[PDB]
Design a protein around this ligand. Structure first.
Ligand SMILES: NCCC[C@H](N)CC(=O)NCCC[C@H](N)CC(=O)NCCC[C@H](N)CC(=O)N[C@@H]1[C@H](O)[C@@H](OC(N)=O)[C@@H](CO)O[C@H]1NC1=N[C@@H]2C(=O)NC[C@@H](O)[C@H]2N1
Ligand SMILES: NCCC[C@H](N)CC(=O)NCCC[C@H](N)CC(=O)NCCC[C@H](N)CC(=O)N[C@@H]1[C@H](O)[C@@H](OC(N)=O)[C@@H](CO)O[C@H]1NC1=N[C@@H]2C(=O)NC[C@@H](O)[C@H]2N1
Lengths: 122, 130
RNA sequence: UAGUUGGUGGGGUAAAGGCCUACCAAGGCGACGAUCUGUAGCGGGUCUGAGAGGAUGAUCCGCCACACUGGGACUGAGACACGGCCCAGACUCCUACGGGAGGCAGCAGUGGGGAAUAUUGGACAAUGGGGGGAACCCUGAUCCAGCCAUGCCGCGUGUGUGA
RNA sequence: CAGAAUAAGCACCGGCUAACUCUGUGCCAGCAGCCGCGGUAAUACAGAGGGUGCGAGCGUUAAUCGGAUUUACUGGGCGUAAAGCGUGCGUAGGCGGCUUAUUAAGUCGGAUGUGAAAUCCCCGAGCUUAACUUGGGAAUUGCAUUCGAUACUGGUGAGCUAGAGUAUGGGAGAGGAUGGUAGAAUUCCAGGUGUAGCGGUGAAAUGCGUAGAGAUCUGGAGGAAUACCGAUGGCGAAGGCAGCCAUCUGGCCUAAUACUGACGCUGAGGUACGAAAGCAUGGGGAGCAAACAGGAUUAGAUACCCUGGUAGUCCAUGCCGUAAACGAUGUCUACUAGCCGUUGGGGCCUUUGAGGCUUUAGUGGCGCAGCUAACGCGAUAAGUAGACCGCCUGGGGAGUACGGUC
RNA sequence: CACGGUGUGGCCGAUGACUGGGGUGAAGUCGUAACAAGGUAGCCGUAGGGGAACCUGCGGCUGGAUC
């Protein structure tokens, strides 16, 4: 581009889009579990993944992953969701915080307890 | 069309040096003569001649070679008709840490960047030579 | 774009001025973006970056604007006035149905919203502000205290020996 | 004053990235920022042992800049990776040959005023240290006024001819428009000779023929296209243009004088032209041939093959505005080894007529330097530089939807 | 002159029986269009036809093999 072309038309910059639009620039969001179900991963993975469909205070209806082994969630539970992708479950872009509102902490764990929200055993 | 005769002169010099010519000739003008005189004083070229046969005038430059390489390794137009460059006395460019010369047109004549710094004036940066 | 652009006579203001009005003329703005439309308080500054740039405008300081929503004026040196007046609108409260009352975006606090942000505290001793001749009175400005690992900085949770 | 007495957790150990083994489970349970782990010996899942990094904190999520030269002013690209408009002309704008005088707008220098305080930085001071507070500086890269300089750019006056253009002689060409005309061939029609096949395919069949085909000879009708020449030839801005003749008409090449004196280059919007197919109205219709019909092939055949055949292909007057509209390479200018062809001209030399040197404008093959990721380009650059315009920013969704113009 | 009312138009959003195409997943069905001369060279524009990739006509390109 010549100097005259730069003066007539500048350099355009392309705005970026957030990977977690349902959070609406908040670190976490409250929601109500519309569904609690199980999905299968894409290839080359094979498992039985635990997912929930949650209606957020932002107005969106999204899907969140439940981490750890064993969860007490059912429909109409009130949960807190944060960002985070699974990358083997299509369309799942958020995680559920274990041990926050209705989600319980994972039991029988003693390593990495702050994630999964397990209190320190005596 | 031809719109930058200074750039034409610099390009002729660069191509002649790359082709190992001994002499390079072009149509003449007082600005090119001044630039050639500055180059000769700085030692990049050997001799400058002007032949005035008629209304036309021809400028001739004798080139220098040293240990199988041309003396002028880089000559670059800086200010151009499409973008003119002016610098103050505190922002005059330095060409490879002073081992080169930046030709500057100032209100006191055409001189090198260090001469302009010594005189405490700025001007238009014509070319970088090294 | 038709008080629209300019001019004259007059009005009006603390003061220049289409600020207003009666005539006269056809002017004025626009690709150097007018008109319309979306978003937005601005700056000193803050973060990042080698720099050029990019992002941002809490806490401190300057300027502007607003005070339940709109339209006005009064008093006064100064307001079109957060805790003043008049009018209109929505909402809320007391009533003995005769009649009345109100505006926390001041400090504290309540409900709600939210992932999330504190006490219905003390004193005018200090610095200021208002009144008074003074004594002195007022001051949720301010100076302090309470709560929170929210951040920065500092310290401790012991030292030596002991095969 | 009494007494170690009241006081230690969090993340991680496959690579990026410092820190490794054992049990449990067997593509399950689960982990995961990216690449990826788990299907019986899992350093990657869960526990334990050990270790690593931090420490009153440790991790996760969200957000900004960076790394990102990933919008490139500093500081990128467009032959084949994304990217040159199909091609011209031209408006605004950008840029613009040489000499000279003048001006001081751009440009440069000095002085003065201002650029609040706080903040950042430096030297100190006070906090038991540090955070923090604070004195003084430096900085605030800016703005304004005024005084100077005149190399370059701009303005003004004068001058010049190397760019650009004009007149006069000569030359080549399928350049364009209109009309006429010639020869070969296909098809149809009539007639003469003459008798069983013709045509078609890998092989066949549909089809034609004893009211006589095919073959052969003579004569008519009509349409479309121009063998040989013919060429890596020519002309045109591009799209494109081929028998011959006349009329109207554009550009180009070439020589020497004379003339004007920068009159130039590019070009957002705009506008003109623009293969084939297609559309409208009226004509024409030999051959060919989308659609369609029949015969074959095939598992099926909707196709490739065969026999027919309508629109169309042709003319007149208009529209449409798209192509792998390609050199996948925008226009203009200057410079940078050589060798061998060819087209249209100019000059010189031999010596009788045909050759040899040059020079210029096109068109080709190699190739030094240089450039490129490579392939390759290489005076017809994709090399070295300048002026202006167009365009690109991962692959799909998508040259799509909505709106608008035609 | 604020607020208000009437008539008629413009713009923004939400919603709507039914309907069209797109993407992702999984390999169930029908074929084999492209990549070798891919078994009819491929592709571009345009027009017609067809269950579907696609086929055919006209013009164009080499980003086509072998002679
Ligand atoms: N004149 C003031 C108008 C204010 C505003 N423009 C309209 C408004 O608020 N109207 C209400 C309304 O008519 C009605 O209330 C409801 N809810 O319908 C009424 C009940 O009496 O009260 C009036 N409000 C009042 N505020 C007043 C108050 O405090 N004292 C004096 C008297 O003026 C009171 N009335
Ligand atoms: N100043 C304005 C002047 C305008 C004028 N245009 C002059 C000009 O500017 N020319 C520039 C030269 C660029 C040239 N077009 C590029 C090129 O040549 N190939 C494109 C690059 C592809 C690849 N990287 C090379 C390649 O595959 N090569 C083949 C190859 O050698 C050979 O093929 C086989 N199978 O062996 C040959 C036989 O066919 O074909 C060549 N291919 C071709 N030969 C043709 C040709 O030269 N042209 C037209 C077109 O047909 C060309 N393709």
């Amino acid at each position: 581009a010549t100097t005259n072309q730069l003066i007539r038309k500048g350099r355009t910059t392309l705005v970026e889009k957030s990977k977690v639009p349902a959070l609406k620039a908040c670190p976490q969001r409250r929601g109500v579990c519309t569904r609690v179900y199980t999905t299968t991963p894409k290839k080359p993975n094979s498992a039985m993944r635990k997912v929930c469909r949650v209606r957020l205070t932002s107005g969106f209806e999204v899907s969140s992953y439940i981490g750890g082994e064993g969860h007490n969630l059912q429909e109409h539970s009130v949960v807190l969701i944060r960002g985070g992708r699974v990358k083997d479950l299509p369309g799942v872009r958020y995680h559920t915080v274990r041990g926050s509102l209705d989600c319980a902490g994972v039991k029988d764990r003693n390593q990495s307890r702050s994630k999964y929200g397990a209190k320190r055993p005596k | 069309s031809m719109q930058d005769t200074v750039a034409d002169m610099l390009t002729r010099v660069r191509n002649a040096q790359m082709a190992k010519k001994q002499t390079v000739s072009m149509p003449s003008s007082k600005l090119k003569v001044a630039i050639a005189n500055v180059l000769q004083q700085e030692g990049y070229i050997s001799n400058v001649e002007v032949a005035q046969e008629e209304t036309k005038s021809t400028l001739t430059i004798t080139l220098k070679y040293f240990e199988g390489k041309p003396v002028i390794e880089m000559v670059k137009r800086v200010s151009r008709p499409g973008l003119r460059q002016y610098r103050g006395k505190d922002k005059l460019p330095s060409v490879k840490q002073g081992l080169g010369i930046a030709i500057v047109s100032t209100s006191k004549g055409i001189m090198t960047d260090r001469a302009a710094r010594a005189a405490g004036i700025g001007g238009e940066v014509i070319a970088f030579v090294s």
